[PDB]
Symmetry: C2
Subunit: 385 residues, 2 copies
Amino acid sequence: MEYKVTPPAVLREPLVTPNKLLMGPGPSNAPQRVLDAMSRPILGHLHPETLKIMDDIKEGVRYLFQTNNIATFCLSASGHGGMEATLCNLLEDGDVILIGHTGHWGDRSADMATRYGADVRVVKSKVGQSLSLDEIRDALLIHKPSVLFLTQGDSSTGVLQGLEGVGALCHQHNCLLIVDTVASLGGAPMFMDRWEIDAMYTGSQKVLGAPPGITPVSFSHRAVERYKRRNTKVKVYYWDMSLVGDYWGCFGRPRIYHHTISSTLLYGLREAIAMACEEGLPALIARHEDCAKRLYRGLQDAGFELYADPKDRLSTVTTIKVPQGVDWLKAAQYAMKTYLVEISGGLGPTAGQVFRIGLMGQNATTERVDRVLQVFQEAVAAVKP
Amino acid sequence: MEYKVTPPAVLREPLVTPNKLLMGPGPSNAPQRVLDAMSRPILGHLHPETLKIMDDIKEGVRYLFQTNNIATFCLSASGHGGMEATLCNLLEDGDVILIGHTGHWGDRSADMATRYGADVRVVKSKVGQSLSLDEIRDALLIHKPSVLFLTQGDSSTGVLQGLEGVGALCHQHNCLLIVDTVASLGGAPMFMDRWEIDAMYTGSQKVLGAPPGITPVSFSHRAVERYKRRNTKVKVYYWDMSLVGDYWGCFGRPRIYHHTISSTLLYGLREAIAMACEEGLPALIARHEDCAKRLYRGLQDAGFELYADPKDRLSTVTTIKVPQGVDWLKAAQYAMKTYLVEISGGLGPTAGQVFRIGLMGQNATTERVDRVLQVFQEAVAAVKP
């Protein structure tokens, strides 16, 4: 009759959430408007007011993506969930996919594609570079894949992948084009429809500054056609484009129960998107690009070496070579302890090789560029001089 | 420079979120303490303060589940993600799973299991009843499965499934037991280890009254052993027990990046779990059971007929037969328009057959029982002759 496990003393303590300047590659600092909204009361997952918020979110993602795709919605999962769903829906066992590897995100997408039963091919960029159009074409011709996967902003290497003409080329060869824009959307140009992109997703917590955990996704008519010609059901009910699309009112069918959406995350995402739409893409993108340029000047004045090829830089995540003799983790710790500012190390192929400074959303301002420049310089100088 | 899609006018309007009394089967009304916590600033997904919150959550779930399992963590997905992940990790192609069907959740689990490539078998409850031990034993003998899946509280039928001795029986037959406790945990006795349950999950938005979208899960040593003997990687990186368990500090390995957890949902869940642990399981379960007893008296005095067998009722979700000549949807609309109180229809097998009144967390009080009884009776009286 005993309860062998007792109520944890730990939970009698107050919840502690220090207010930090998150100048890593994400999450970025939430606008106060988005934090306030997440105190709103919970709504039922199928209540008209919830569906209204979802509808408004769809219009906002269509703007941000520049698409008219009817199959536009959000996944109830973090950014990886976008990668998962896009692969899960558009691959069957033995389908050949080509991954355009420009950093860690090439490794992660290859992993998921293999877990889903695909025949995974990879074309690797030169170090610190994007893939050229020629390199992409050559690999397409060689592999003859049904899917090509590219990461527009690879946050591990700070590399922005060019996309003009690639969807067109894919479509000459019965190939679908999937693009990750988690780190890049709002910090670099994107025109989903104009660039013939078939499936695309972004993150809530990067340029948008919404909470992590809900991810906008869109599928073209060609991608929907692919889904319709599947011989077997997608492996995960949770990601099934038809079923979540129906919940999100995409295909003219009744709304029905698929899962309970997090109305909290809807509130924060909706306000974040409203803010971004009000600023407008041209101003939003320009602000991130201009901030990044200011960062480069300060870093290069101070004698630091940037990792990415200057032609290939992503505004939102700047990779900086760790100077000979500095302990990057100790530098990070110094910055956090003294200032409550986050500076980050690398990821995947750049683990231990770089620092990464994110300039995203609330943090892409001249004041915050200057702050991160100051504390980064101080932290590096502080450690083994 | 050409933006064919324009900033949506809809997002210029205020976000609107009416505060309703959610007396359907979930989500339930959030404590003010949980809503307040969700305005806290976002933290980095690997920051020590974040890992501390996750650690504290693990202690709380171990308490609520009554388990010492090291493989205890939360999934960054809604309740369906618990079912997905538990099936995904514990099934390989051709594995025989037996589903104990006591309502909708038997159909949904059978669905996911077939999607994941399992050889799916079903044993079905008598209408409005739980499965007996003999019925389970007989089915085990016929199918000889490697996993049995049961739903402790099936929210579609309002049925509580008895679990004493079933894990033991499963283990006598080289079978793992998976149990869904989304609707039942906190509203009915549960002792995961004592009852020899191998995998279990709950929902954040039911008894706990946290936001939807993060789901506590736990796996026994036997379950972990099953995982370790797979010859194939789990199909979804996002659900992989080993990888999310490592992010959650479960297996003695370094914490690494798996995905960006949602700060906001952590805070809400942390607070909800803290509150439940402070009340304690004995008082928490008793409160739900007593509130349900009060509701049954009120309903039966008013001449309504309960759907579930008196011996098999789930405290947290009460199924009520829709009287002859009542439009259930119309009655629900009436209650929502006049009082902002939610009463729900049916789900899956009970769709169009029942009303469902949830008594969960903040809404399991004598006052709220009396409120829903008053509005339910008024709403039904309004649409009937």
